[PDB]
Write a protein that binds this DNA or RNA. Sequence first.
RNA 1: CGAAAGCUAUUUAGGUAGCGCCUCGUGAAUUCAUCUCCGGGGGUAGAGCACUGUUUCGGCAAGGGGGUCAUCCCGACUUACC
RNA 2: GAAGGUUGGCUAAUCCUGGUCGGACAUCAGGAGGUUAGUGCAAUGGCAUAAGCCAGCUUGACUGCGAGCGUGACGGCGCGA
RNA 3: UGCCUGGCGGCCGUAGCGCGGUGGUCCCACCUGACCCCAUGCCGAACUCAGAAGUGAAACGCCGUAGCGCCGAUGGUAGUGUGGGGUCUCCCCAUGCGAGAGUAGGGAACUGCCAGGCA
Lengths: 76, 51, 94, 177, 60, 116, 136
Amino acid sequence: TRNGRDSEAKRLGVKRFGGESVLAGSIIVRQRGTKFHAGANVGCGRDHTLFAKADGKVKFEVKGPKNRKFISIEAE
Amino acid sequence: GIREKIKLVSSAGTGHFYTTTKNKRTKPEKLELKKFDPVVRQHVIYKEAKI
Amino acid sequence: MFTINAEVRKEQGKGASRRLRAANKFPAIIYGGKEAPLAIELDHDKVMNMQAKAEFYSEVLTIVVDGKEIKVKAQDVQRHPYKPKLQHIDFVRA
Amino acid sequence: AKLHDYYKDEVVKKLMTEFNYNSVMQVPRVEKITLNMGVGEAIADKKLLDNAAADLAAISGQKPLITKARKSVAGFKIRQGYPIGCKVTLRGERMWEFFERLITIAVPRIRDFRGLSAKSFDGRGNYSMGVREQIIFPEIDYDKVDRVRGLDITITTTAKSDEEGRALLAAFDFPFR
Amino acid sequence: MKKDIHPKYEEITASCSCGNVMKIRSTVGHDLNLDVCSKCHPFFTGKQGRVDRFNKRFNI
Amino acid sequence: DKKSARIRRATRARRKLQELGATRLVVHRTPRHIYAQVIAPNGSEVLVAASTVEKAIAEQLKYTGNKDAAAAVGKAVAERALEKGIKDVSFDRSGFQYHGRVQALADAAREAGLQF
Amino acid sequence: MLQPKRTKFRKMHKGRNRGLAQGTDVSFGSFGLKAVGRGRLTARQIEAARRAMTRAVKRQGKIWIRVFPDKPITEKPLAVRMGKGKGNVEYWVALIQPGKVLYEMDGVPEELAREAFKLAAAKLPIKTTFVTKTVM
RNA sequence: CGAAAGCUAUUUAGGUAGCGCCUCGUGAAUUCAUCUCCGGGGGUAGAGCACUGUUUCGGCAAGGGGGUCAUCCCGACUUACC
RNA sequence: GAAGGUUGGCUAAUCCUGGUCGGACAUCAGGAGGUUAGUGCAAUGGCAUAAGCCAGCUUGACUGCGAGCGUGACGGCGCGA
RNA sequence: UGCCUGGCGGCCGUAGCGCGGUGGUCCCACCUGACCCCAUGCCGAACUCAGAAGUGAAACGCCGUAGCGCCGAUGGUAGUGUGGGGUCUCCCCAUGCGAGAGUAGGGAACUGCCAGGCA
Ligand SMILES: [Mg+2]
Ligand SMILES: [Mg+2]
Ligand SMILES: [Mg+2]
Ligand SMILES: [Mg+2]
Ligand SMILES: [Mg+2]
Ligand SMILES: [Mg+2]
Ligand SMILES: [Mg+2]
Ligand SMILES: [Mg+2]
Ligand SMILES: [Mg+2]
Ligand SMILES: [Mg+2]
């Protein structure tokens, strides 16, 4: 067979969902590209990981003229 | 892989060195960068040397 | 010229509609104007026969619901996928 | 400029009362002149584009821009970014002086000259013309011509239609057959 | 315009054959002497048959 | 289009200022006038404004669209802000190049007291 | 013998064939042959039925084939064991669900269409019925 | 009381190791489960055809492959045509 | 060793119309279009505030550390203010 | 307190296109000129500066108008969790959830802060 190859699964996806209480540094989503964009109190890493920059609750929301999904942290 | 390993040697006399790679066929001129020398704790000129 | 006898539906949904069709009746809806839509049941065979004729789909019809005459026009029909049966009809108030 | 004076004095009034214009800026203007040289023979010798560019500088009086192949094209042995032409954009005093030079020295110097077409309008009031040879210009010397290079000349205008474009270019007595 | 990159663009003189003189800026350096100008060319001023051909040699 | 291009130029710095929660000294320039607004971090409240369309400023100026007018606007907006106890803003050039009239405004606001 | 001029992939997952058909109305002519059953129609079957109906109407009128066999079916050669990769594409089929109008016809009387469609149905592996276009 | 025949690695594949699952002991939080309510991301079922491809019919057809003419460059001139 | 950093700037494919050589296709001008382009290299997810294109200055392709988190049986690998 | 306008936002097509009309006191725009500050891989086109004679042509704003985009029920249909069943490649029944598409219809945005001009 010419086939028979694959790669290891990368375990991407949302790690903390809406309303979850996280500590600063906690990874919220792992992704390829900015499928989600960083909102308030959230940073975007070199591999587009979104992580909490403050303690608080995860909040998903859609905004902007392109209807894009932003992830923010609402402080406690 | 044709890029070869080189070292960047401190000009401060400390002996501290960085390492990198370099396409010697296309870029024969010696690499020279200003980099942090942690022994003297200053940014100084570093110069290419053999690995 | 087409008069249709109808009854206001007691229950809605998939199970209710399928039970209606298992008993030789089928659901229909009347909408249009400012009044709320009216969900009705029709006897399948009589309406099937009526709509065999193409004047059913272009003239004003009259549905009698508890004696009240409502003038409508057929707006859409849902047909059974392969049997000569009717599944649902939309009637717009005219 | 000298022909901008002519425009501002005569051409605006004549075109206003010919076209029932509301405002003076509804009248077509001559906004820019572009001169280029397809010198794809540079592929062979870069020196060519250099000589074509110097010819263009002599003709126009401002240094040209070296234009590059937008893509790689297999039909001419050109890669993306290989220089195959020159261009000068003239606006203001220089474009008006060039307009007068071209109209009153250059076009009389074209072999078998029998008028320029009036169908050469792009469709939106812009006129383009070619120059088989460069000597038609007195700014290029003859006893030194290294090669015979022509050029293209385009006159962009604010004229919305070809009719308004011809009308404006005619007000200057542009030799239309 | 930029500095020192442009051709020396000085006002020159240009005299036609029909007596037309135009004071022109161009990048030639010397003055201009030209045979035909816009005001003495055939097309600008509007200066640009077999029965006759047969009958020119055919006085009956 | 000139204005759409300028807005696109301004957007990145404006978004950065938004996410930094920085009180913004936003400048608007036209060939006849120049404007300055100190806008709160929420983006929808103006704390202090000064412009050459105001008479208290235009009266003391010859032409409202030159560098001296921009300097007057910058000084005015800075002193108005400092009377509010604002004292630390970030400059938003609004896609205008940091130069000429905008720069004169910013320099006047700085030497008058505003921190940026 | 219908099959796609090209495809982005050579081989397809077997899949399943659930649900009711889309395209249950006579949309191009006056008469149609509608599937009552569920199954696969091979390109050879579709072609045989087409030839039958077309010969019946003496190539008068017009005929529409609404279904197209875009599904490749592989088979493993005789005397090969299991595994060793997927078999070779052998024929092309169209998945049919009950309600699918298979053919349409116009320009002939209803009786002639009925007889042409009966002769056609004799070639197909799925139960069918005759349908006429409706006002709505 | 009460499994497993799984994951990962292995000259490993009917062996073994760590993890999972059993057992015994100790300690500890409303620690855990079910239901109800609340906050979430989603792209499967279904559907659809703007996109990537595939598909048939009609209309308008860039247009080309074949025969006329005209023929130096040209032009007209059909298509079984496609 | 810029194809990295940063600052400033910029916006695609394709087609149509006009134009010396010059043609199906080069460079120029206008219009349509709106990313159908682009991404050093697969595919996928991204990308206009561009991550796509150009230029100036440059070495953060720094050294010691690291709240917290992701992912692994483990060895480990990753993201990070 | 009303009308117009400029800036910064909320919101992200019920808000965007198209078509037509309309405005210059102010504002905005085009505009005027340029050795200059600054700029063109050429060009004062853009960027920039010094201005205010001209004009609302273009742009922009506003007004109107469904040819589109966009939004969008009700009812039915599809799918589906749990339990049950059949003629079991697929379905059906009870119960809960219930689309997509389409139909009626809606629709020519709404709105906060500050500044300027008129009333
Ligand atoms: Mg059910
Ligand atoms: Mg037990
Ligand atoms: Mg063994
Ligand atoms: Mg599906
Ligand atoms: Mg940048
Ligand atoms: Mg970069
Ligand atoms: Mg200007
Ligand atoms: Mg107007
Ligand atoms: Mg719906
Ligand atoms: Mg509108």
